[PDB]
Amino acid sequence: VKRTYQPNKRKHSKVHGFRKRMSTKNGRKVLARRRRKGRKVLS
Amino acid sequence: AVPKRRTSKTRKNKRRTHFKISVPGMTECPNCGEYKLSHRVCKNCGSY
Amino acid sequence: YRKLGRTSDQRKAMLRDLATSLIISERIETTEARAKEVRSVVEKLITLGKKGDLASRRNAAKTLRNVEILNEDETTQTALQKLFGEIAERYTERQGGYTRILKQGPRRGDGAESVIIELV
Amino acid sequence: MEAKAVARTIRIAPRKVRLVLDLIRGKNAAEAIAILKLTNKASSPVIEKVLMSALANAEHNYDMNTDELVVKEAYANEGPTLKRFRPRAQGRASAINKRTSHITIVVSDGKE
RNA sequence: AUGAUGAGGUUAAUAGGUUCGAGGUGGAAGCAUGGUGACAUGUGGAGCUGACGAAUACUAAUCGAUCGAAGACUUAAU
RNA sequence: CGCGAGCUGGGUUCAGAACGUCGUGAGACAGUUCGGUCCCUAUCCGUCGUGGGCGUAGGAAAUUUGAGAGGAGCUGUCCUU
RNA sequence: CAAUGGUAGGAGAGCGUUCUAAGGGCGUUGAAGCAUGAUCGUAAGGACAUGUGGAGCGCUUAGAAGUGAGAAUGCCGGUGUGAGUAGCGAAAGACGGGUGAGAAUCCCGUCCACCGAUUGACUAAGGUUUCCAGAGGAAGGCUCGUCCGCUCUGGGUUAGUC
RNA sequence: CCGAUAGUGAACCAGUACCGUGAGGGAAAGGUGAAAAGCACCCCGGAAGGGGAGUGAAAUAGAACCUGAAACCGUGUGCUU
RNA sequence: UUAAGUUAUUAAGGGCGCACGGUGGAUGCCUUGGCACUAGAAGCCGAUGAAGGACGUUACUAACGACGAUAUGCUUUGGGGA
Numbered sequence A: 001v002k003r004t005y006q007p008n009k010r011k012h013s014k015v016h017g018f019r020k021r022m023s024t025k026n027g028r029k030v031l032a033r034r035r036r037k038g039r040k041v042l043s
Numbered sequence B: 001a002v003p004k005r006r007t008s009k010t011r012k013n014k015r016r017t018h019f020k021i022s023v024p025g026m027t028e029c030p031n032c033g034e035y036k037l038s039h040r041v042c043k044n045c046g047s048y
Numbered sequence C: 001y002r003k004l005g006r007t008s009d010q011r012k013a014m015l016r017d018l019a020t021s022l023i024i025s026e027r028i029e030t031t032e033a034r035a036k037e038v039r040s041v042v043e044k045l046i047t048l049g050k051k052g053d054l055a056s057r058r059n060a061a062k063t064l065r066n067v068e069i070l071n072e073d074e075t076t077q078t079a080l081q082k083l084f085g086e087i088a089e090r091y092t093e094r095q096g097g098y099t100r101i102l103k104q105g106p107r108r109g110d111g112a113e114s115v116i117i118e119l120v
Numbered sequence D: 001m002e003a004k005a006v007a008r009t010i011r012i013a014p015r016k017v018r019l020v021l022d023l024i025r026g027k028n029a030a031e032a033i034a035i036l037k038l039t040n041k042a043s044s045p046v047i048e049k050v051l052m053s054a055l056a057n058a059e060h061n062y063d064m065n066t067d068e069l070v071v072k073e074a075y076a077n078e079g080p081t082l083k084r085f086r087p088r089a090q091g092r093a094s095a096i097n098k099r100t101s102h103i104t105i106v107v108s109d110g111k112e
Numbered sequence E: 001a002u003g004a005u006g007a008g009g010u011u012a013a014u015a016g017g018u019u020c021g022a023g024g025u026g027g028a029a030g031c032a033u034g035g036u037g038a039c040a041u042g043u044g045g046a047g048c049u050g051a052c053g054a055a056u057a058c059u060a061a062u063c064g065a066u067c068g069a070a071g072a073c074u075u076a077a078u
Numbered sequence F: 001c002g003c004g005a006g007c008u009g010g011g012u013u014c015a016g017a018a019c020g021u022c023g024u025g026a027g028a029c030a031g032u033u034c035g036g037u038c039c040c041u042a043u044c045c046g047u048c049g050u051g052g053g054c055g056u057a058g059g060a061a062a063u064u065u066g067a068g069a070g071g072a073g074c075u076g077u078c079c080u081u
Numbered sequence G: 001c002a003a004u005g006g007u008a009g010g011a012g013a014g015c016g017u018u019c020u021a022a023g024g025g026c027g028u029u030g031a032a033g034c035a036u037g038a039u040c041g042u043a044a045g046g047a048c049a050u051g052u053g054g055a056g057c058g059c060u061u062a063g064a065a066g067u068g069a070g071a072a073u074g075c076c077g078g079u080g081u082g083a084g085u086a087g088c089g090a091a092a093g094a095c096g097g098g099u100g101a102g103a104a105u106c107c108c109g110u111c112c113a114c115c116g117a118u119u120g121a122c123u124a125a126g127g128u129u130u131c132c133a134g135a136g137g138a139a140g141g142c143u144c145g146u147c148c149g150c151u152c153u154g155g156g157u158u159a160g161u162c
Numbered sequence H: 001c002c003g004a005u006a007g008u009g010a011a012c013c014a015g016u017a018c019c020g021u022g023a024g025g026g027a028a029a030g031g032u033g034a035a036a037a038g039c040a041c042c043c044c045g046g047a048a049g050g051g052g053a054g055u056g057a058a059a060u061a062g063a064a065c066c067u068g069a070a071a072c073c074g075u076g077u078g079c080u081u
Numbered sequence I: 001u002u003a004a005g006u007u008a009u010u011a012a013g014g015g016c017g018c019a020c021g022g023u024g025g026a027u028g029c030c031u032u033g034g035c036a037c038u039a040g041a042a043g044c045c046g047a048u049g050a051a052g053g054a055c056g057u058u059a060c061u062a063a064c065g066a067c068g069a070u071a072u073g074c075u076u077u078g079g080g081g082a
């Protein structure tokens, strides 16, 4: 059966990805929290 | 269809009283003196 | 008789193939049940060979596979020709037997009693 | 008077080896070897190996003879188990314990 | 089901094969004749035939090994 | 109202729908109607068969009596008198 | 001389664990833990001896508390039982030769069988090194394994026109 | 005040394994010895292991390495059935 | 010898004690790290390109620090003493 997450590099990097989070202030937030947390993969 | 209770060590060891391997049907080989299975060809020599 | 844990078409085929291979090699290694069941087939083929008339040749052609043996000096001849020219003579005077069986110990991968069925 | 030989962390479940070690307990060395080499089980090659190690140890370290050698006692006990899983149905996973065995054999000349 | 039960292990018919037969099928192959051919007829109830009946050691039950008694006291007849 | 870890699932008792009735309404009625997922590898006792051990004052091969136990246990028509 | 069953519950006396203050002590001539024992007190519990153990720890008085577990379908970690039971995930294999400590399972060969609007050839998306040649066998392969999409070593992707 | 189920989630390549499309969520895991003196050689084995010899105070301190409880699994047996 | 009566032995296995092993990681002892504070600095870094990172850099080679084509670092003063 068709399950979820039919992977796609372009959409993955479009809906997510550094420049997309840097396009909205709320996007800028999640990077802020992820650095405060010391995350290694930020977007 | 599930065990209503534990099988104690006593019951366990009791059930497996008859669960054992038998010593092989081995006889001495007439050409080499090493043991072989009866009615089989000796694997050390290769006789009868 | 035995079924050998196998269907009818797959057994018919296995028995005839095993008989052919025995005829090629004159002694092979296999499990007890299949030796016990190829014994009769190979013995009956040799009987078809002890007559050599064209009817028995044509009739024994049913079972044997078509194989080629390279003898010494690069001489070539098929299973039928072997049966009717090199094995009919050997057992012209013997009135049975034609095969022996030598039990061997169990194999490793299973507990199957391997045996060697050989043309006597 | 006694010779030791041990195989540790053998990849066979101890209760599977113990069946075979329930035959060579207290028998002579030659008869014991003939049993192992002819018993058609999985653990048998790994135990025969231990018997040869024990007899070699006896000859090379104590210079006792390998004919009057009875098997004083031979046993097997659990080892460091390896834990694995099998993907079963409806997303559930069941466990598989790949066990091991610490096989011990001591052969004696039956004296002091 | 396995184990048991039963028929046998060479001083042997227990099973296989070989030979003969029962039963089943129904006129094998190769020939010769006739037909343009599709086919038909004689050989020849032929040929084939798993379990069914009998004979025959031709092949396998060759070699070997384990277990298994020596008989309690008491009293009465003896 | 024996028996669904032996079976079915037609009725009834989920969500869909529809008619009659009641309710302004959401909805409702033991009023109808069409449709609607029956899971479980048996541990113990129990039961039906089938083995091994031991005891029956020696070790054995065969034939056994029967303390008990179980199974059967039904009945029609015709003729004769 | 009288009293002493007891649940919700009230009252009193206490036993134990960690730490602190002081005093006094014990310790490689073997501390704490751990194990055993047939020892002592009315109880919570306290000693002693012998083994393992290889450095800290008792006793008196008094202070403080993360102070006492058997149950919460408690949480975490180990190990059972069911049991050598269920399962071994659609299918055709047989045999000769070789390799090895070991082979139904690896390599070669013959025969046989399955697909064949496809289990065949391409190419996208996606995965990223699984690709190739040597070597290995712990682990992963639902068995075995000398084998591999596994492990170790060294390699491999070449565009003016796609 | 805690001494590795505590004390930070994290004493140790930790906001990391891993999980999720993502926001996010999130672990487990310290201790050989004084010194590495980390076991020269020999023996069985293809190897893993082992058994001697040697190092060391100690090697049931041998690298999964201080102490090593209980559940649990074995091997003997004195007394029972 | 025959009767009549009585009683062992047995242990396929099991029970209880005892001894010796295994797994397992509790306990005791230990501290690499935490926690809560007191006193004294400090309490703005960036178009002079910041905070964070990515790719690199060693004799060999991945990781972690460190440092960036002058890359496991370069110049200088003062200490610095194998």
Ligand SMILES: CC[C@H]1OC(=O)[C@H](C)[C@@H](OC(=O)NCCCOCCC#Cc2ccc3c(=O)c(C(=O)O)cn(C)c3c2)[C@H](C)[C@@H](O[C@@H]2O[C@H](C)C[C@H](N(C)C)[C@H]2O)[C@](C)(OC)C[C@@H](C)C(=O)[C@H](C)[C@H]2NC(=O)O[C@@]21C
Pocket (backbone or CB within 6 Å): F014, F038, F039
């Ligand atoms: C395949 C394995 C899974 O088994 C099952 O599905 C079986 C089939 C199921 O049998 C039954 O249906 N009844 C027997 C059939 C009776 O029909 C009469 C007509 C009807 C009806 C009805 C009524 C209301 C609702 C409802 O209101 C509603 C909603 O959503 O609101 C949803 N519908 C569908 C309803 C339908 C099990 C066994 C079921 O138990 C039984 O239910 C009864 C309520 C009580 C039974 N007793 C206590 C008297 C009980 O024995 C359960 C509840 O499953 C649904 C089992 C539970 C434990 C599970 O959840 C397991 C994990 C299952 N889930 C799964 O994945 O594995 C299963 C094993």
Ligand SMILES: [Mg+2]
Pocket (backbone or CB within 6 Å): D091
């Ligand atoms: Mg799934």
